[PDB]
Amino acid sequence: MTTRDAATIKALLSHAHEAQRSGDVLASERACWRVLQIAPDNSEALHLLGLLHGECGNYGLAATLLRRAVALDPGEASYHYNLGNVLVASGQVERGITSLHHALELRPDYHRAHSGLYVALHYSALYDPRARHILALDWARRYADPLTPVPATPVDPDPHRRLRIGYVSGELRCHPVGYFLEPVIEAHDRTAYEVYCYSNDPRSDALTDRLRALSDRWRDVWPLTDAELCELVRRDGIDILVDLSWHLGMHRLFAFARRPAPVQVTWLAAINTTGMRAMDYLVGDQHLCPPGSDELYTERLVRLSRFYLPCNPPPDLPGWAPADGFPVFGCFNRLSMIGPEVLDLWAKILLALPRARLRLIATGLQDPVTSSRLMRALEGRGVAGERLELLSPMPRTDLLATYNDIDVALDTLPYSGCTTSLEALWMGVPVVTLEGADMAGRATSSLLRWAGLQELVSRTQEEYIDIALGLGRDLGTLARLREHLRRWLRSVSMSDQGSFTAELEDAYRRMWRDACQTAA
Ligand SMILES: O=c1ccn([C@@H]2O[C@H](COP(=O)(O)OP(=O)(O)O)[C@@H](O)[C@H]2O)c(=O)[nH]1
């Protein structure tokens, strides 16, 4: 006789895939375990448990589930793809890049692995701006530019009429994207603009409920094809469509590829070009996007004369403590951003201030394997591993509150942080950064320059060290900077929401004028 197993597995395996596509993680996981109880060499279920734990941040389990899936079926490109992403996210950038290469070698038309690879390069100093640029263009040429028509003249090209703005993202939720979009959506001038949001992910938390309520129109987009989304955007009559996700998120750039709107913009998540002809504008700022940078972008750079994001803090802000070995340095950035280049500098700072402690908080630090590897990485640079204190990730306000126990924040290179740096300043903690010759290494350099704190902005790695040393020694400059931030916080709490979105609206208007104008 034979067994009904194969049928039971298949029903569990499709149920598991539905559960994960709809957002129900705990249900997809338990179904994957049920498959492995019956058939523990099932590489499809190993793989899916791999993804889910990778999304949850358990990179230790994730990686070994995905490596076992690779061993059982090494020809399957998607198993290599997802292993590469886990490895990059865990801090092992070069090992992940290799895995991403394998996925492309096995399936040369893998558009998600090609993006992932493009993204991954920004976490490594080994790939210059020319290499990243080329790979992006290569992607666009393959998957985007074939779909793109020539720019048509806008419908009802009235330079002064009320404009419809469409925000397209798959991280409209408790997430940097959602955090910076909320103020913009609330403060948009309804006399001159109308706000459509296109949510490209099913996860709907308290912030999505707020974004939905603040939007004029909503639209849940994840179940639609790119062609279906295009005919939806066209029917809504969107004048300016905005890519909030970029290559880093659950984007919808093949819908953008077709030019459903006459003005198409990438903003907020972008750290480099999309590579696409179909993207007209990228919205940055004057410090963020350096003078000779434009040749690196298919989009036209829009250098706003303020910081490229709204800096007003949330209402539920923990509020500052009276302060409290000194000094405690801090870096609450993703592990992908903490590689060999940064660790070399952080070690040199810790040798020169032999009592100072470094405090990292990120996803993956719950696993002993990844915290051990980080401790050992520092000991190899002559720094005792006990001086390094690693913490598992926390809720937003709980994390904000732990800045009270930090004297100075350190920013990553070559991929500069952004929202962690802003969060630090909100809690009266100064941030030391390197200004890279590169948009991806300038999110903090810009922020700091626009907030008056140019003295915390190094142009060289040895200057980075010196600034961090200077702050660890002098209590006075710390108390000066803590007050500068107290005044800045209040100023930004009051004006910055409306001040920013007016400057952005000014940019949207000039994009629109120019679209109508050149039809004459
Ligand atoms: O343990 C953590 C770490 C981060 N975050 C939040 O998620 C964001 C992720 O920032 P990231 O680590 O990607 O660095 P960034 O790119 O903002 O510099 C932060 O701003 C925090 O608000 C959190 O809730 N818990």
Numbering used by the authors: 1 to 324, 329 to 524
Can you provide the manuscript's text about this entry?
In this report, we describe the identification of the first complete putative bacterial protein O-GlcNAcylation system, found in the soil thermophile Thermobaculum terrenum.
TtOGT was co-crystallized with the product of O-GlcNAc transfer, UDP. The structure, solved by molecular replacement and refined against synchrotron diffraction data of 2.8 Å, revealed an ordered N-terminal TPR domain and a bilobal catalytic domain at the C terminus. However, a deletion at the region previously designated as the tetratricopeptide-like region (TLR) results in a major change in the orientation of the TPR domain relative to the GT41 catalytic domain compared with hOGT. This more direct/rigid fusion of the TtOGT TPRs to the GT41 domain compared with that of hOGT creates a relatively narrow groove for the protein substrates to bind near the active site. However, the GT41 domain of TtOGT is similar to that of hOGT (r.m.s.d. = 1.5 Å for 303 Cα atoms) despite the absence of the intervening domain of unknown function that is positioned between the two lobes of this domain in hOGT. It is proposed that the presence of an oxyanion hole formed by backbone amides of His920, Thr921, and Thr922 (equivalent to Cys422, Thr423, and Thr424 in TtOGT; maximum atomic shift of 1.7 Å), an α-helical electrostatic dipole, and the evolutionarily conserved Lys842 (Lys341in TtOGT) function together to ensure the correct positioning of the donor substrate and to stabilize the negative charge developing on the leaving group. Strikingly, the hydrophobic pocket formed by Met501, Leu502, and Cys917 at the hOGT active site, which fits the N-acetyl moiety of UDP-GlcNAc in the hOGT active site, is not apparent in the TtOGT·UDP complex.
